[PDB]
Amino acid sequence: CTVDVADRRKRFWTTQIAACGTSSDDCGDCARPGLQLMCNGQGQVTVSTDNYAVGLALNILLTDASKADTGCGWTPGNRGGFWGDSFRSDNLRSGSKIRQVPTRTSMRETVSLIRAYALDDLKKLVTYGVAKSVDVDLTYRGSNKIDMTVIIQGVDGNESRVGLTGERISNAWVWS
Amino acid sequence: CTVDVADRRKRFWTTQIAACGTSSDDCGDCARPGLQLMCNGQGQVTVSTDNYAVGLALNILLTDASKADTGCGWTPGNRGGFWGDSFRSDNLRSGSKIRQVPTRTSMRETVSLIRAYALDDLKKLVTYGVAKSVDVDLTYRGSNKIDMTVIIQGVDGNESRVGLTGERISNAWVWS
Amino acid sequence: CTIQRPDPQDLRNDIATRFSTNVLGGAPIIPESNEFYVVSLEYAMQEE
Amino acid sequence: GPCYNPDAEYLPASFKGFSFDADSSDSDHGRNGAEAEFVFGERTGYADLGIKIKSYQLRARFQTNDHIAQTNAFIAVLESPGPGLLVHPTRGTVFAACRSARVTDSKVDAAGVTYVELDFVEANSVLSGFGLVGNLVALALAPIITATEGSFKRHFSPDNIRYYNTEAVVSTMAQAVTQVQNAYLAISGNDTSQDKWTTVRDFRNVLIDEFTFYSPANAWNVLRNGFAILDAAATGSDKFNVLRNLINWSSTHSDLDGESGDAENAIFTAVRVLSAAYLAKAYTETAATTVNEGLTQYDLIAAVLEQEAQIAKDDCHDNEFFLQIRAFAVDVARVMVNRAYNSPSLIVYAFPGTVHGLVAAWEIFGDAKRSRDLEARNNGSPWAVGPKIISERV
Amino acid sequence: MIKPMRIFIGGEELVTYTSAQLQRTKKQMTGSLTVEIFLDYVPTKPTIVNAVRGKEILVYIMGELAFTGAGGDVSVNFSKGNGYSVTLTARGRTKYLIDSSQTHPTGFFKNTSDKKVIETLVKEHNVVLQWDAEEIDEPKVTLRDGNRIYNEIFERCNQNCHFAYETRDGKLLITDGTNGTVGEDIILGYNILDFSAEQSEDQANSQITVKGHRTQKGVWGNDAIVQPVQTVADSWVGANIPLTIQHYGDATNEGLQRRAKFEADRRAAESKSVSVTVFHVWDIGTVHYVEIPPEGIFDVLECVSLTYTVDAKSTLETKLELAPPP
């Protein structure tokens, strides 16, 4: 009984930044995310399950969404997306489309376009009920360099504040 | 019989200004209101019941009301008000909100805000039926200092005037 | 029976061995972990 | 702003793939509800009735040496059947459907330019047959009942068992029906209506006669109607202990051999499976007090069902009943899990130290009369509840 | 494609119908199609007419049969400004049973069953009977001289509970229960464009007492004048609202109780009438779960009626009338 206060809900494997190490290519150092294997005292490895929200954000940013219908067409196998979206019930798509920007001159317009796309795609974190106020701060024009820091606002696993305007996220058990 | 006229309604205890005495703090002398105990000829103390309207006005001004919904929320126990308001039938709130002014520059504007809040709160004196013409004359800007003279128009326990625009309020037995 | 219905324990050992050789790269599994429960489900599904 | 770049902030307009440049952008959001005006009263009412359908209004321009061809192509696209995907300049992508498109075009007043006034509506599909949504709030007991019927009539034929065991087998059946009768009588209690007099008369009449349970049809009909009456006699919590006792009674195995053991085991399996089904239905009829309570009740039922599924397969008695039991188990799993986690959405508020029941209820809900609800969930004196409190989602 | 209908007067797939209303019901024997055709007239060129007054039609709804039976009438209208319309009406193939007059030679069926008396009261106009209830035996069946092919059936299926209506193929269904075939759980907030539930109290009855007389062979006196009675009760209404609906053939105990329960289901099914208007266009006896919490419906109800309506402007909606969850 009284023990109750701890959800029996668990978390599955989570993709993590720099799980497979950096990859230098003389332009900089990338992250190459993947799955982190946590070892034990006596063999018995196990996949890690931390940073759930960042895991969803990586799953969203780093997967191509469906392309838009053009008169040119697409190769049967290049039109992006996931067939598993045919079975979900929330009536949404899976992935992002930052890599589908219609490039143009005057890189300020390209920056604004990428901002719009990244924000529209990351809003699915709030729509799923995992964060509350995800937001981006994409600001640069350089030659082509761009910085795109992302903030994923979260909660705790026990409602400690009374009288909020919104409504507790539906999945505040991941701790966001 | 002919010696009837005496409303059999009594008055309960009333909070009074300076019942517990002033509290010097080198900036001035405040009032510290409480309950006045009247002694008798032979022991037998008793709580006074004078100055009912000013007592209600004190209970209104010196009680924090429920705060407004924000985006961050409030601690479960700091959101003001009184649970006893869940049982009254007049559909109103108990307390005042002059301590919740969103302070700003140009103290003239804070003066106007405190005026609006105090007048909105003290209109409940007329709404409950204890006064008729409450009004304030908040007029200063100084450094931060402000005067807030309050007038509470009252009546007597016998209608001695005929042909009024309004009505004998509701509770003219408290003498207002 | 008509197909074969192998010994349960042997079937679970084979399922766990496949899961360790493929996903965990050859290491055994922590009891009462996510992978342990995944293996138990698969087993139930193969039984069905 | 001073350096606001307009065409880098408004999205380029396009409907159904055909792109065009827009000159305006409107919308008609809203929300529709009633308005009550009770007679002779200084009061008013309001009742929110849903969402108001959105509509968008645009104005396209065509200023090019070939604006006639572009206008005609645009007209051909706008009159194509069905809704299409629209890119509103200031609201992004929506699914809209054209409703009117006026095409104004003068010659000796303004030659060269063509303006088009467009009026779109938010357009979503439905499906075709008015929304085949499934009431996942509910358990369906018909499939498992028919499966138990099949499994019972497959292994119960008191005309095909050895003559020196038929009496024992039929006596086992009669004893099971006696158990269900005692269950009903213990659950009805203070029921006085004449239905309660006739049902009791029918139980005796069926238990007195001798040749009733010698046929599988009558045996199964008696059992199924007895369970249906035991269900229809009370509601919710009341039916717990009774049903649980049945699960204990039918948790034994038969000592006879050959087909006799199979017949008695069919009786026990039918009773246990029916009781687990109706106990799940009884759990569903009452609201969960805590997440752990709902999960523990589901664990009980899933344990019983899995035990019966492993029994129905040990030497491949009947594979079909094993499959049916497994499907029923996943069904009751979804129902009981949704009941434990989402029937009331329970949260654990963390107060700074213990508070009263009234104070906690009024801080959480804004209404202290709901303090009566904080007593069934939290243990602790009414004057010190917490400092962690389980309650409903606001 | 949203396309529901494709009407065939004989093979001519209607492509001009400016509107349509198709109604099916259990309270009656037939349905009612109502098409609206354009029918232009150029007063110099030759024009052609269709005098069908009987040429047979069907309405495949959303790629499936809905009706089967322009027999009704032709109603060519006129006006100066919006004239030249043709309203065609088409009842159900089980119609002549409704507008005829019995022409069976004998008139006195002896030692027959209601099924048989119904088979010979129908096979005079080639309407195959979908008997799916039971066989009840009755000694004396005298048909009132030329009454009506439908009044007599309705009389013979009311004193032994049997709903009498028409299916989608074009047959006469004499049932006793439901058509099974469960379906969409209409929930308030999900698809109900409009709803109206009305469970009144002026059309209910606590005790229904059925009396009558025995019409068997040899039975006379008390056993045919005194005994036959029955008192069925609906332990849901409330106070003593009695009644006495008398019987009109071979009053057996089962016959009495059965006529009684038939009416005790009629009055029941009228004491909670739920009309719902849903959106897009299979429920003539279907049961559905319905959820309208504000009026306290959380129950499984049977659709008594079904009406598809259309009009090229703002329509495509279906109106269902449902059956109470006692």
Coordinates of C-alpha atoms in Angstrom, one line a residue, chain B residues 20-135:
Chain B
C20 CA -3.4 44.7 20.3
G21 CA -1.6 48.1 20.3
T22 CA 0.8 49.8 18.0
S23 CA 4.2 48.3 16.9
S24 CA 6.9 50.9 16.4
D25 CA 9.5 49.9 13.9
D26 CA 11.3 53.3 13.4
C27 CA 9.6 53.8 10.1
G28 CA 6.3 54.6 11.9
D29 CA 3.6 53.2 14.1
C30 CA 1.2 50.6 12.6
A31 CA -1.9 49.3 14.3
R32 CA -1.8 45.5 14.9
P33 CA -5.6 44.8 15.0
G34 CA -7.1 41.9 17.0
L35 CA -9.9 41.2 19.4
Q36 CA -10.6 43.6 22.3
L37 CA -11.4 42.0 25.7
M38 CA -13.7 44.1 27.9
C39 CA -13.4 43.5 31.7
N40 CA -16.4 43.8 34.1
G41 CA -17.0 44.8 37.7
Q42 CA -16.0 41.4 39.0
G43 CA -13.7 39.5 36.7
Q44 CA -15.7 38.0 33.8
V45 CA -14.0 39.4 30.7
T46 CA -15.9 39.6 27.4
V47 CA -15.0 40.3 23.8
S48 CA -16.3 43.7 22.5
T49 CA -18.7 44.0 19.6
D50 CA -18.4 47.6 18.5
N51 CA -17.6 49.1 15.1
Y52 CA -18.9 46.3 12.9
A53 CA -18.4 47.9 9.5
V54 CA -14.8 48.8 10.1
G55 CA -14.3 45.3 11.4
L56 CA -15.6 43.8 8.2
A57 CA -13.4 46.2 6.2
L58 CA -10.4 45.1 8.1
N59 CA -11.2 41.4 7.6
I60 CA -11.5 42.2 3.9
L61 CA -8.3 44.2 3.5
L62 CA -6.1 42.1 5.7
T63 CA -6.8 38.7 4.1
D64 CA -5.1 37.5 1.0
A65 CA -7.4 36.3 -1.7
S66 CA -6.8 33.6 -4.3
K67 CA -4.1 34.5 -6.8
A68 CA -4.6 34.4 -10.5
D69 CA -3.6 31.5 -12.7
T70 CA -0.1 31.9 -14.1
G71 CA 2.0 29.7 -16.4
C72 CA 4.4 28.5 -13.7
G73 CA 1.8 27.9 -11.0
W74 CA 1.8 28.2 -7.3
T75 CA 2.9 26.1 -4.4
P76 CA 0.2 23.8 -3.1
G77 CA -0.6 25.9 -0.1
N78 CA 0.3 29.4 -1.1
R79 CA -2.6 30.0 -3.5
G80 CA -4.5 32.4 -1.3
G81 CA -8.2 32.4 -0.3
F82 CA -10.2 30.5 2.3
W83 CA -11.7 27.0 1.8
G84 CA -14.8 28.2 3.6
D85 CA -15.7 30.0 0.4
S86 CA -16.7 26.7 -1.1
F87 CA -19.9 26.7 1.0
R88 CA -21.3 30.3 0.7
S89 CA -24.1 30.8 -1.8
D90 CA -23.5 34.3 -3.0
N91 CA -20.8 33.2 -5.5
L92 CA -18.1 35.6 -4.3
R93 CA -14.5 35.4 -3.0
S94 CA -13.2 36.3 0.4
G95 CA -10.3 38.6 0.9
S96 CA -8.5 41.4 -1.0
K97 CA -5.7 41.5 -3.6
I98 CA -3.9 44.8 -3.0
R99 CA -0.8 42.8 -2.0
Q100 CA -0.7 41.2 -5.5
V101 CA -0.2 44.3 -7.6
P102 CA 2.2 43.7 -10.4
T103 CA 4.6 46.5 -9.4
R104 CA 6.0 48.7 -12.1
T105 CA 7.8 51.9 -12.8
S106 CA 6.1 55.4 -12.7
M107 CA 4.5 55.0 -9.2
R108 CA 1.5 57.0 -10.5
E109 CA 0.5 53.9 -12.3
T110 CA 0.9 51.7 -9.2
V111 CA -1.2 54.3 -7.4
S112 CA -3.9 53.8 -10.0
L113 CA -3.7 50.1 -9.7
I114 CA -3.9 50.1 -5.9
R115 CA -6.9 52.3 -6.2
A116 CA -8.6 50.0 -8.6
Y117 CA -7.9 46.9 -6.4
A118 CA -8.9 48.5 -3.1
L119 CA -12.1 49.9 -4.6
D120 CA -13.0 46.6 -6.2
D121 CA -12.5 44.8 -2.9
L122 CA -14.3 47.3 -0.7
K123 CA -17.3 47.3 -3.1
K124 CA -18.1 44.0 -1.3
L125 CA -19.0 46.1 1.7
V126 CA -21.9 47.5 -0.3
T127 CA -22.6 44.1 -1.9
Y128 CA -23.0 42.3 1.4
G129 CA -25.3 45.1 2.5
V130 CA -23.4 46.7 5.3
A131 CA -22.5 50.1 3.9
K132 CA -23.9 52.1 1.0
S133 CA -21.3 54.5 -0.4
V134 CA -17.8 53.3 0.3
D135 CA -15.0 55.3 -1.4

